[PDB]
Design a protein around this ligand. Structure first.
Ligand SMILES: C[C@@H]1C[C@@H]([C@H](O)CC2CC(=O)NC(=O)C2)C(=O)[C@@H](C)C1
Lengths: 52, 102, 51, 42
RNA sequence: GCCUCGAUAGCUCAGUUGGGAGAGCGUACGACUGAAGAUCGUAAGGUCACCAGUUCGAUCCUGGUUCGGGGCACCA
RNA sequence: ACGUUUCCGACCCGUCUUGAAACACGGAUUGCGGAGUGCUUGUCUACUGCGAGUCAAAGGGUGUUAAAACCUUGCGGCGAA
RNA sequence: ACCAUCUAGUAGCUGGUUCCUUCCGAAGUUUCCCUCAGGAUAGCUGGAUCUCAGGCAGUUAUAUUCGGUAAAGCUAAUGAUU
RNA sequence: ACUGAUUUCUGCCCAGUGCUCUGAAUGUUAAAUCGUAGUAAUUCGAGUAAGCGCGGGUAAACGGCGGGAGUAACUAUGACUC
RNA sequence: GACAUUGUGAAGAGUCAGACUCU
RNA sequence: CUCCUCGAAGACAGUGUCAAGCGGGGAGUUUGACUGGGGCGGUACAUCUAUCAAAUCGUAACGUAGGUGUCCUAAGGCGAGCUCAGAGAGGACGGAAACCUCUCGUAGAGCAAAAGGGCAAAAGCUUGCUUGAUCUUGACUUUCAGUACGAGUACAGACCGCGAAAGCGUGGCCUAUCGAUCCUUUUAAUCCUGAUUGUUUCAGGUAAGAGGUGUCAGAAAAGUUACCACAGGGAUAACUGGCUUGUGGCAGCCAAGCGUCCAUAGCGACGUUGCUUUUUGAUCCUUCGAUGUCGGCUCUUCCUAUCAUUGCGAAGCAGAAUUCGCCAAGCGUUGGAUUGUUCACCCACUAAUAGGGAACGUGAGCUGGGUUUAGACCGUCGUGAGACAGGUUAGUUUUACCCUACUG
RNA sequence: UUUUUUUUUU
């Protein structure tokens, strides 16, 4: 009663059933994982710029 | 594996700098009979019912992770550093030579 | 398992002695003054077979 | 019986059992100091 | 077929981490004996089964090949 | 139209199964009975009332178409850190 | 042994699971589990809808890139080989 | 408990496992007890029985009871030898 | 094996300072 | 006269409680998984390399060839200098091989280990100094559910090492070398709590390590059942049937040779092409709410790859005889000893003693000798229960009156 | 203490 039976038969069809979802367009706006020193300097710069 | 008996390394205590440390091997302390776990285990064992907790019987490890206990010579602050597994371990053994006959 | 014959012998059921026709227990006379300070004469009236 | 069973009629274990064995196990030569035919006086 | 074990003088068996190849019998020489045998004093002796690798160096450690030997080979 | 006769089509249902008409299992026939429920606790959803509040418990007062309905909470639950 | 009760004992297993129309409509695949007749997990599916009114596409074009299979080569390295 | 009339016999092995007998045996041993430290919980140490471990016996107790070479005036075999 | 049931006398040894411990 | 009824033992025994030893006599429970059925074997269970893999990545089998549970105070870090394997040519003892010298030398060496990548003023060799193999939090990659562990990447803060400096350094040139909860234990704060107030012990907490689960996301675990049971399974074996035909059987093509000479009368090696399912295998499609599982007896029919007979052709055919071949299954293909036997072997006759199918034809046709329950014996194996396609003995063979077929 | 053998006829 062998029961390993791996396959990839219908998986592409299942994936395309609902369409392949491309990544959003705001992912490039976040500064997550950016250099800590650069982020610190950016925070200081943003804190001080005079609005008018 | 040979490890020197003295090592200059960062001191996490008051010094907050690199200082000399005497290196020894950490040995597990004797189990106290008034620890909460031992008290609970003894109370559970006492009575009728036989063994109440599993007994491990399938040892597979042939080694242990040696812990070097290093005590700073300036404030006696103590660090513990595990090293990789090794069959043989010695502290301050004879350093290896080069270009010598056997 | 079940009890062995040796274990079963102790309950004294079918393993009791068969003593319907026994003629009595073999015993000397109880110790008393005659036997302690002299002798007493008895007559052997019978010799019989005890099952 | 402790001796019962087997594809051959054999005891399988020593017939000499200790004095303090349990009621259902004390079968055979109980607390035997020796075994076999007696050669000499005894 | 599967799982193990061994292979070393002419024969039977040890041997070391890996740095010696040994023990007995056998063979050769001399001695004692009228002569042989026992006995005494000497000598020489192995395919470290074959191959490849590992390290300074392997009979040995590792892998493969040849021969021999042992155990299992059950249901129905 | 469950009558007859013609032409075409027409394998026995339920079930497990990759695959059943199966030489796979259940089923001779009919009537009646026959199987996702109750409750506690969560969560989401829909609707209703009020809304930083809301619901009020046990209880008390009343009620004789009196186990109902109606009135009643320094305090309690949830919410407000 | 038998009788009653615990007891409607538990079952990852076998069997059954009762009205009609309309619309949508799969999976036998991933990971973990004393796991392999089973579960949880993601995937596939239905429903409720809500926010809006051009940025997407199992398709092409342009531009730029990745690969070492077919073919080719050993009169080029390695390994065979007349 | 084993064997199983009569007749004739019942060989070797106490290494293993059992059973059993001695104990001087500080080898190992629980509770209790005693001593040390501490203000106390408590810590450390000493004794510490039987058993086990050491020694002996026992197989009509459970049971067990080998390999490789050479060798005889035809060959074969192997009394004999290693 | 210890404690209790468990009482009354002797001798020896050892601890102490009349007691305890043992046999 | 004596308030010991007469003796024995006697503060021991016995009794009560606790402690230790023995304790399958008895109780409860367990006795992994994968697997071309299970068992045995193996580990393909955690895991790395090359290939499979069909040019992104990904991709399976008990696929192929191998590796891992270690090793290293240096074999980590860094600075400097140097160049390796090997070849050629020279030099007392020196030889094929010791050391010295000069040329050439794209890496053909070495880098702890398996394989594959990478590396030449280095990542290799020599050497100096060192401990970045340290402390701290986040982000990310790999597996992936985009969980965890493990491993790794690029930064940020501290303190350091080497260097003149730029720089490099969080272990090993890269790809494997490893571990949850609970519990114990250690280190850390001049920390928190013990709730009648405080002090000190003790205990418990917050943070980081270690002690281990290799069935490696991590139960504490020995057998037997032929006295056996239950829920299921044709997801899964033993008998038939189905596919395949390695093996079994049968038939062809070229001719090197045999055949006194002569390859083909009759054979035919080395090669090679087919056929068949009366062998045994492979598979696991049907059947486990059952298709009665060997052989023999009995009785039909069918096929031939023709033993005999009919009609013929060819011979290494002068004839009893014998061989090959063609048309040919119309008709025959026996009696027995041994064995349960199918097979096998022998005795005898015979025209001949041909081979096979029909659910390995035929058990509501028989029989039951074998196999194949429960009783029992021996050998080997096992401590034991018990096991053994090892031997032996004894062991219940049920139902047609229905439909069809067939006979009347 | 140990101390085994001597081919056939003459
Ligand atoms: C660290 C490792 C494990 C640990 C212990 O046994 C593990 C626990 C785990 C659990 O959840 N329950 C248990 O009863 C056992 C132990 O004493 C040693 C084997 C060492």
């Amino acid at each position: 009663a062998k029961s390993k039976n791996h396959t990839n038969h219908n998986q592409n069809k299942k994936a395309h059933r609902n369409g392949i979802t491309k990544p959003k367009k705001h992912i490039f706006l976040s500064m997550k994982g950016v250099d800590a020193k650069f982020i610190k300097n950016l925070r200081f710069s943003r804190k001080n710029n005079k609005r008018q | 594996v040979n490890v020197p008996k003295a090592r200059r390394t960062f001191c996490d205590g008051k010094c907050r700098k690199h200082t000399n440390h005497k290196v020894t091997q950490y040995k597990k302390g004797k189990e106290s009979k008034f620890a909460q776990g031992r008290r609970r285990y003894d109370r559970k064992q006492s009575g009728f019912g036989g063994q109440t907790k599993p007994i491990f019987r399938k040892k597979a490890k042939t080694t242990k992770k040696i812990v070097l206990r290093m005590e700073c010579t300036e404030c006696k602050h103590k660090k513990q550093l595990p090293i990789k597994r090794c069959k043989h371990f010695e502290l301050g053994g004879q350093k290896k030579s080069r270009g010598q006959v056997i | 398992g079940r009890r062995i014959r040796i274990q079963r012998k102790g309950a004294g059921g079918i393993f009791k002695s068969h003593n319907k026709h026994r003629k009595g227990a073999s015993k000397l006379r109880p110790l008393d003054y005659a036997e302690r300070h002299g002798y007493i004469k008895g007559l052997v009236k019978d010799i019989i077979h005890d099952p | 019986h402790p001796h019962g069973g087997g594809n051959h009629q054999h005891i399988g274990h020593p017939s000499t059992v200790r004095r303090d064995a349990s009621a259902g196990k004390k079968v055979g030569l109980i607390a035997a100091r020796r075994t076999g035919r007696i050669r000499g006086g005894k």
